[PDB]
Short mmCIF file of C-alpha atoms and ligand atoms in Angstrom, two decimals:
data_model
loop_
_atom_site.label_atom_id
_atom_site.label_comp_id
_atom_site.label_asym_id
_atom_site.label_seq_id
_atom_site.Cartn_x
_atom_site.Cartn_y
_atom_site.Cartn_z
CA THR H 1 0.00 0.00 0.00
CA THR H 2 1.98 3.00 -1.42
CA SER H 3 0.99 6.48 -2.74
CA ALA H 4 3.61 8.92 -4.22
CA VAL H 5 4.65 12.60 -3.91
CA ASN H 6 6.12 14.46 -6.91
CA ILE H 7 7.50 18.03 -6.91
CA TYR H 8 7.91 20.30 -9.90
CA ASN H 9 9.05 23.87 -10.24
CA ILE H 10 7.21 25.63 -13.05
CA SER H 11 8.46 28.94 -14.42
CA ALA H 12 5.89 31.33 -15.92
CA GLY H 13 5.56 30.24 -19.59
CA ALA H 14 6.81 26.76 -19.01
CA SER H 15 5.26 23.34 -19.07
CA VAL H 16 6.25 20.09 -17.22
CA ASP H 17 5.58 16.43 -18.13
CA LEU H 18 4.55 14.52 -15.01
CA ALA H 19 6.81 11.70 -13.70
CA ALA H 20 3.57 10.10 -12.43
CA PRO H 21 0.02 10.64 -13.80
CA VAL H 22 -2.90 12.45 -12.16
CA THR H 23 -6.10 10.38 -12.40
CA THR H 24 -9.31 10.02 -10.26
CA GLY H 25 -8.60 10.08 -6.52
CA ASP H 26 -5.43 12.18 -6.98
CA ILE H 27 -4.43 15.75 -5.91
CA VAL H 28 -2.34 18.56 -7.53
CA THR H 29 -1.51 21.78 -5.66
CA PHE H 30 0.17 24.84 -7.19
CA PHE H 31 2.00 26.95 -4.60
CA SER H 32 2.94 30.61 -5.26
CA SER H 33 5.27 32.52 -2.88
CA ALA H 34 3.75 35.90 -3.80
CA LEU H 35 0.33 37.42 -4.30
CA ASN H 36 -0.21 40.51 -6.40
CA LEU H 37 -3.97 41.24 -6.61
CA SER H 38 -3.21 44.90 -7.42
CA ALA H 39 -1.08 43.68 -10.32
CA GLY H 40 -2.72 45.43 -13.21
CA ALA H 41 -4.03 44.14 -16.48
CA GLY H 42 -3.77 40.72 -18.09
CA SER H 43 -4.32 40.45 -21.86
CA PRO H 44 -6.57 38.84 -20.97
CA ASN H 45 -4.97 36.50 -18.36
CA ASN H 46 -2.81 37.68 -15.50
CA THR H 47 -2.01 34.05 -14.77
CA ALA H 48 -3.29 30.79 -16.07
CA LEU H 49 -2.65 27.34 -14.59
CA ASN H 50 -3.34 24.38 -16.81
CA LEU H 51 -3.78 20.64 -16.54
CA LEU H 52 -2.88 19.04 -19.91
CA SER H 53 -3.50 15.47 -21.17
CA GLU H 54 -1.02 13.25 -23.14
CA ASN H 55 -1.63 14.96 -26.56
CA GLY H 56 -1.51 18.64 -25.42
CA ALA H 57 -5.24 19.11 -24.81
CA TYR H 58 -6.51 21.16 -21.82
CA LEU H 59 -8.48 19.16 -19.32
CA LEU H 60 -8.48 22.31 -17.11
CA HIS H 61 -7.49 25.92 -17.69
CA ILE H 62 -7.69 28.26 -14.71
CA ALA H 63 -7.29 31.93 -15.62
CA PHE H 64 -7.19 34.92 -13.29
CA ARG H 65 -8.32 38.16 -14.83
CA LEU H 66 -8.02 41.19 -12.56
CA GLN H 67 -9.40 43.74 -15.03
CA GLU H 68 -12.45 41.55 -15.75
CA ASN H 69 -12.60 40.63 -12.03
CA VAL H 70 -13.25 36.93 -12.73
CA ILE H 71 -11.66 33.48 -12.52
CA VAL H 72 -12.27 31.63 -15.76
CA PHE H 73 -12.38 27.86 -16.12
CA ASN H 74 -12.50 25.90 -19.34
CA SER H 75 -11.31 22.84 -21.25
CA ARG H 76 -10.50 22.23 -24.88
CA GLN H 77 -9.16 19.73 -27.37
CA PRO H 78 -5.74 20.15 -29.02
CA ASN H 79 -6.01 22.64 -31.97
CA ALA H 80 -9.80 22.78 -31.39
CA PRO H 81 -11.77 25.81 -30.13
CA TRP H 82 -12.11 26.72 -26.44
CA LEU H 83 -15.17 24.99 -25.05
CA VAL H 84 -17.92 26.31 -22.66
CA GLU H 85 -16.43 28.90 -20.19
CA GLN H 86 -17.32 28.94 -16.55
CA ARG H 87 -16.76 32.00 -14.42
CA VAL H 88 -16.55 32.99 -10.75
CA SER H 89 -16.57 36.73 -9.94
CA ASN H 90 -14.45 38.71 -7.49
CA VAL H 91 -10.86 37.41 -7.84
CA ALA H 92 -9.39 39.26 -4.86
CA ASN H 93 -12.12 37.78 -2.60
CA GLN H 94 -11.24 34.12 -3.17
CA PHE H 95 -7.70 34.96 -1.87
CA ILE H 96 -8.53 36.48 1.57
CA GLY H 97 -6.60 33.90 3.55
CA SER H 98 -2.88 34.48 3.09
CA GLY H 99 -1.45 37.81 1.85
CA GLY H 100 1.93 37.57 0.08
CA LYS H 101 1.36 33.89 -0.92
CA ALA H 102 -1.34 31.41 -2.13
CA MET H 103 -2.09 27.86 -3.21
CA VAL H 104 -4.38 26.38 -5.88
CA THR H 105 -5.44 22.74 -5.43
CA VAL H 106 -7.16 20.57 -8.02
CA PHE H 107 -8.83 17.40 -6.67
CA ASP H 108 -9.44 15.00 -9.58
CA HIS H 109 -12.86 13.55 -8.82
CA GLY H 110 -13.27 11.60 -12.10
CA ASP H 111 -16.37 13.28 -13.54
CA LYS H 112 -15.36 16.69 -12.07
CA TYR H 113 -12.49 18.79 -10.74
CA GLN H 114 -12.85 20.49 -7.43
CA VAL H 115 -10.68 23.63 -7.48
CA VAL H 116 -9.73 24.97 -4.04
CA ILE H 117 -7.90 28.23 -3.48
CA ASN H 118 -6.16 28.03 -0.16
CA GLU H 119 -8.97 26.61 2.02
CA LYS H 120 -11.99 27.68 -0.13
CA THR H 121 -13.59 25.55 -2.91
CA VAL H 122 -14.04 28.02 -5.73
CA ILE H 123 -15.59 25.63 -8.36
CA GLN H 124 -16.81 22.03 -8.76
CA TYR H 125 -16.02 21.97 -12.46
CA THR H 126 -18.00 19.27 -14.21
CA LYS H 127 -15.52 17.94 -16.81
CA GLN H 128 -15.90 18.71 -20.49
CA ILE H 129 -13.07 16.32 -21.34
CA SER H 130 -12.02 13.00 -19.70
CA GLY H 131 -8.45 11.88 -19.32
CA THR H 132 -5.19 11.52 -17.47
CA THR H 133 -3.16 14.65 -16.68
CA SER H 134 0.45 14.29 -18.04
CA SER H 135 1.46 17.87 -18.28
CA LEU H 136 0.88 20.96 -16.13
CA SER H 137 1.64 24.46 -17.29
CA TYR H 138 1.75 27.99 -15.95
CA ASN H 139 1.34 31.18 -18.06
CA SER H 140 1.27 34.84 -17.34
CA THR H 141 1.21 38.08 -19.22
CA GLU H 142 4.62 39.64 -18.32
CA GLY H 143 4.52 42.18 -15.41
CA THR H 144 1.05 41.30 -14.15
CA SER H 145 1.09 37.72 -12.77
CA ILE H 146 -0.89 37.53 -9.59
CA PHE H 147 1.62 34.76 -8.65
CA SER H 148 5.42 34.29 -8.22
CA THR H 149 7.51 33.76 -11.46
CA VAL H 150 8.15 30.25 -10.27
CA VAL H 151 5.20 28.20 -8.96
CA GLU H 152 5.87 24.92 -7.14
CA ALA H 153 3.47 22.16 -8.12
CA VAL H 154 3.21 19.12 -5.83
CA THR H 155 1.31 16.01 -7.01
CA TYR H 156 -0.03 13.29 -4.71
CA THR H 157 -0.59 10.21 -6.92
CA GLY H 158 -1.07 6.46 -6.45
CA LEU H 159 -4.01 7.62 -4.30
CA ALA H 160 -6.65 5.14 -5.76
CA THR V 1 -17.37 13.53 -2.96
CA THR V 2 -15.92 16.93 -1.84
CA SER V 3 -12.49 17.36 -0.20
CA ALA V 4 -11.02 19.98 2.13
CA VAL V 5 -7.69 21.77 2.22
CA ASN V 6 -6.69 23.16 5.58
CA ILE V 7 -3.58 25.23 6.06
CA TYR V 8 -1.77 25.75 9.39
CA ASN V 9 1.19 27.86 10.53
CA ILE V 10 3.29 26.08 13.15
CA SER V 11 6.06 27.78 15.05
CA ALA V 12 8.67 25.70 16.80
CA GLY V 13 7.36 24.73 20.23
CA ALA V 14 3.74 25.00 19.11
CA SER V 15 0.78 22.62 18.74
CA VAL V 16 -2.23 22.98 16.36
CA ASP V 17 -5.80 21.51 16.45
CA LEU V 18 -7.12 20.29 13.07
CA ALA V 19 -10.50 21.77 12.03
CA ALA V 20 -10.68 18.57 9.94
CA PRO V 21 -9.19 15.50 11.66
CA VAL V 22 -6.91 13.29 9.50
CA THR V 23 -8.07 9.68 9.02
CA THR V 24 -7.44 6.70 6.66
CA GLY V 25 -7.01 7.97 3.15
CA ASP V 26 -5.99 11.50 4.35
CA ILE V 27 -2.70 13.42 4.07
CA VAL V 28 -0.55 15.89 5.95
CA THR V 29 2.36 17.75 4.40
CA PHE V 30 4.73 19.91 6.42
CA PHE V 31 6.59 22.62 4.42
CA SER V 32 9.92 24.02 5.62
CA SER V 33 11.17 27.18 3.92
CA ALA V 34 14.61 26.26 5.32
CA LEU V 35 16.87 23.17 5.47
CA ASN V 36 19.72 23.52 8.09
CA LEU V 37 21.58 20.17 7.95
CA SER V 38 24.47 21.57 10.11
CA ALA V 39 22.43 23.11 12.90
CA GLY V 40 23.03 20.38 15.55
CA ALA V 41 23.35 18.86 18.04
CA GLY V 42 19.70 18.39 19.24
CA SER V 43 18.63 17.22 22.84
CA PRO V 44 18.41 14.71 21.23
CA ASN V 45 15.88 15.93 18.57
CA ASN V 46 17.03 18.80 16.28
CA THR V 47 13.44 18.75 14.96
CA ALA V 48 10.29 16.73 15.66
CA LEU V 49 6.96 16.49 13.77
CA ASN V 50 3.97 14.86 15.52
CA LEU V 51 0.54 13.52 14.57
CA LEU V 52 -1.69 13.29 17.66
CA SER V 53 -5.14 12.37 18.97
CA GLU V 54 -7.65 14.42 21.03
CA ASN V 55 -6.62 12.27 24.04
CA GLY V 56 -3.09 13.26 23.07
CA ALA V 57 -1.56 9.98 21.98
CA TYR V 58 1.50 10.48 19.70
CA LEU V 59 0.20 8.43 16.81
CA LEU V 60 3.31 9.34 14.80
CA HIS V 61 6.43 11.08 16.10
CA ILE V 62 9.14 11.85 13.54
CA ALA V 63 12.34 13.17 15.09
CA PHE V 64 15.47 14.35 13.21
CA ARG V 65 18.76 13.81 15.10
CA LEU V 66 21.86 15.24 13.37
CA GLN V 67 24.41 14.13 16.00
CA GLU V 68 23.30 10.44 16.17
CA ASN V 69 22.62 10.94 12.39
CA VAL V 70 19.18 9.23 12.40
CA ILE V 71 15.43 9.88 11.87
CA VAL V 72 13.44 8.26 14.71
CA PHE V 73 9.81 7.10 14.21
CA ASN V 74 7.96 6.29 17.45
CA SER V 75 4.56 6.68 19.23
CA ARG V 76 3.47 7.04 22.90
CA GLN V 77 0.29 7.30 25.00
CA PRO V 78 -0.51 10.48 27.07
CA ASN V 79 1.80 10.63 30.15
CA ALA V 80 3.32 7.23 29.31
CA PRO V 81 6.67 5.84 27.95
CA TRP V 82 7.67 5.54 24.23
CA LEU V 83 6.94 2.40 22.23
CA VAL V 84 9.21 0.40 19.79
CA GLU V 85 11.53 3.00 18.07
CA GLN V 86 12.21 2.63 14.39
CA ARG V 87 15.37 4.27 13.10
CA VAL V 88 16.34 5.37 9.61
CA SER V 89 20.11 5.87 9.25
CA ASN V 90 21.75 8.89 7.60
CA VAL V 91 19.85 12.20 7.70
CA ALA V 92 21.21 14.15 4.66
CA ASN V 93 20.69 11.02 2.43
CA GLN V 94 16.96 11.38 3.04
CA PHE V 95 17.07 14.86 1.49
CA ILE V 96 18.81 14.04 -1.84
CA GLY V 97 18.64 17.16 -4.10
CA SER V 98 16.62 19.01 -1.50
CA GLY V 99 18.38 22.42 -1.78
CA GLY V 100 17.21 25.13 0.61
CA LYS V 101 13.71 23.89 1.60
CA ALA V 102 11.99 20.56 2.35
CA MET V 103 8.70 18.94 2.72
CA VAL V 104 7.63 15.96 4.79
CA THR V 105 4.46 14.11 3.83
CA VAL V 106 2.58 11.64 5.97
CA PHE V 107 -0.04 9.36 4.43
CA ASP V 108 -2.59 7.76 6.78
CA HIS V 109 -2.96 4.32 5.08
CA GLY V 110 -4.87 2.70 7.96
CA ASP V 111 -2.39 -0.08 8.85
CA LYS V 112 0.78 2.01 8.16
CA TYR V 113 1.81 5.71 8.06
CA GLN V 114 3.81 6.27 4.84
CA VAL V 115 6.41 8.99 5.39
CA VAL V 116 7.92 10.76 2.37
CA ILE V 117 10.68 13.35 2.59
CA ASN V 118 10.34 15.51 -0.56
CA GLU V 119 9.89 12.81 -3.18
CA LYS V 120 11.61 9.87 -1.36
CA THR V 121 9.63 7.45 0.80
CA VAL V 122 11.68 6.94 4.03
CA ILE V 123 9.54 4.49 5.99
CA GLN V 124 6.29 2.54 5.82
CA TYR V 125 5.46 2.64 9.55
CA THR V 126 3.27 0.04 11.23
CA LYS V 127 0.94 1.95 13.52
CA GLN V 128 1.68 1.40 17.24
CA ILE V 129 -1.27 3.56 18.35
CA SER V 130 -4.39 3.68 16.08
CA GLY V 131 -7.20 5.92 14.91
CA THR V 132 -7.72 9.35 13.40
CA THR V 133 -5.18 12.20 13.66
CA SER V 134 -6.90 15.03 15.48
CA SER V 135 -3.86 17.36 16.04
CA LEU V 136 -0.19 18.40 14.92
CA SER V 137 3.06 19.86 16.53
CA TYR V 138 6.57 21.04 15.66
CA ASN V 139 9.33 20.75 18.23
CA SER V 140 12.95 21.77 17.89
CA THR V 141 15.99 22.07 20.12
CA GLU V 142 17.50 25.49 20.89
CA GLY V 143 18.27 27.02 17.56
CA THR V 144 19.45 23.72 16.08
CA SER V 145 16.27 22.82 14.11
CA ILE V 146 16.86 21.53 10.56
CA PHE V 147 13.72 23.36 9.37
CA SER V 148 12.55 27.00 9.25
CA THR V 149 11.18 28.81 12.36
CA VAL V 150 7.65 28.19 11.21
CA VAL V 151 6.54 25.08 9.30
CA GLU V 152 3.35 25.31 7.21
CA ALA V 153 1.12 22.24 7.50
CA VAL V 154 -1.37 21.35 4.73
CA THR V 155 -3.99 18.72 5.33
CA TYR V 156 -5.95 17.04 2.58
CA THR V 157 -9.05 15.40 4.15
CA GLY V 158 -12.18 13.58 2.87
CA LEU V 159 -10.32 11.52 0.27
CA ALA V 160 -11.62 7.88 0.27
O1 LIG U 201 -12.13 30.41 -22.12
C1 LIG U 201 -10.79 30.64 -21.65
C2 LIG U 201 -10.00 31.27 -22.79
O2 LIG U 201 -10.50 32.60 -23.04
C3 LIG U 201 -9.82 33.32 -24.07
O3 LIG U 201 -10.29 34.67 -24.23
C4 LIG U 201 -11.63 34.64 -24.79
C5 LIG U 201 -12.68 35.27 -23.86
O4 LIG U 201 -12.73 34.57 -22.62
C6 LIG U 201 -14.07 35.26 -24.52
O5 LIG U 201 -15.19 35.58 -23.64
C7 LIG U 201 -13.83 36.23 -25.68
O6 LIG U 201 -15.04 36.59 -26.29
O7 LIG U 201 -12.88 35.71 -26.66
C8 LIG U 201 -11.58 35.27 -26.21
C9 LIG U 201 -10.86 34.27 -27.15
O8 LIG U 201 -11.37 32.90 -27.11
C10 LIG U 201 -8.35 33.38 -23.68
O9 LIG U 201 -7.69 34.24 -24.62
C11 LIG U 201 -7.81 31.94 -23.62
O10 LIG U 201 -6.40 31.97 -23.43
C12 LIG U 201 -8.49 31.30 -22.45
O11 LIG U 201 -8.22 32.13 -21.27
O1 LIG U 202 11.76 7.67 21.22
C1 LIG U 202 11.00 8.84 20.95
C2 LIG U 202 11.63 9.76 21.96
O2 LIG U 202 12.93 9.26 22.12
C3 LIG U 202 13.63 9.86 23.23
O3 LIG U 202 14.94 9.30 23.23
C4 LIG U 202 14.96 7.89 23.50
C5 LIG U 202 16.21 7.40 22.72
O4 LIG U 202 15.97 7.31 21.31
C6 LIG U 202 16.82 6.14 23.33
O5 LIG U 202 18.16 6.00 22.89
C7 LIG U 202 16.92 6.76 24.71
O6 LIG U 202 18.17 6.76 25.40
O7 LIG U 202 15.75 6.51 25.46
C8 LIG U 202 14.97 7.65 25.04
C9 LIG U 202 13.60 7.53 25.69
O8 LIG U 202 13.79 8.33 26.87
C10 LIG U 202 13.73 11.39 23.13
O9 LIG U 202 14.00 11.93 24.43
C11 LIG U 202 12.37 11.97 22.74
O10 LIG U 202 12.37 13.41 22.74
C12 LIG U 202 11.67 11.22 21.58
O11 LIG U 202 12.13 11.30 20.22
#
């Protein structure tokens, strides 16, 4: 009876293939050592965190938009259009926990993803696409990330 | 099928009560923003991390001893003596390519606690005192702790 922990640094703009895969029952948390909710204007995304499947599809895209004051979730296929957007308003509100740092956890629930920011569940995203996560990525628009330039992802796998 | 993330700030010498007790299937991770592998000696423990009950049984005690150069895993009842110690030899070899921070993960697997330093499992530990983890502490000697002044503890609960 053995689960695993895996630890990745992700620079803004970079992707990472996962040493182990995230499937149902598993957890991935993105840790940022800074929080800039006065950061300015994304075009449109201040920061996006992404779970990507084997072929470069987005199972989950989490995008913080200060100037639109929303957090935007979505999925898509590789080279195909962005699917049905979901939104949660007030960005700065979901972060009242820690100043100067934050964490974003994605609980893979099989049919959904629970997304928790620090201690607060911000969406129970019903999946638009099924599949194993093999890749995580972090983007920003330069000069306006709400998060550090490096984000530490930790994965807890072997859970099921 | 909804999970909880709880975050806790533990200073050396302190104890914290979990708003969501840890049980079979659950996870604690302790995050040190420091790694001082030349801080010793301890008395004997440079650093200790503890998973307790409401009745205050040490369900899992993890002590780091630089001088004896060992990680001790033990448990004890409230106001009683320690049980059968388990010892892992060679402290810095448990932190291979750690750098200037560390994390320690405990999995509650029911029969055994699975302890992982960063990405390396260090022990599968046959429970000597059973049940759910209801509390956490961080103990250090003098200023000889191998971790940072404050450790951040993240619990993942409601997993199975
Ligand atoms: O859906 C996430 C996706 O949005 C793109 O921007 C959209 C915008 O959200 C939509 O309402 C607008 O009308 O058109 C834009 C282009 O699809 C982002 O550019 C993309 O990166 C994701 O963040
Ligand atoms: O065993 C957990 C507990 O150990 C104590 O030290 C032990 C020690 O490992 C053994 O060699 C010793 O001489 O008997 C001791 C029990 O008194 C530490 O004092 C303690 O803080 C814990 O880590």
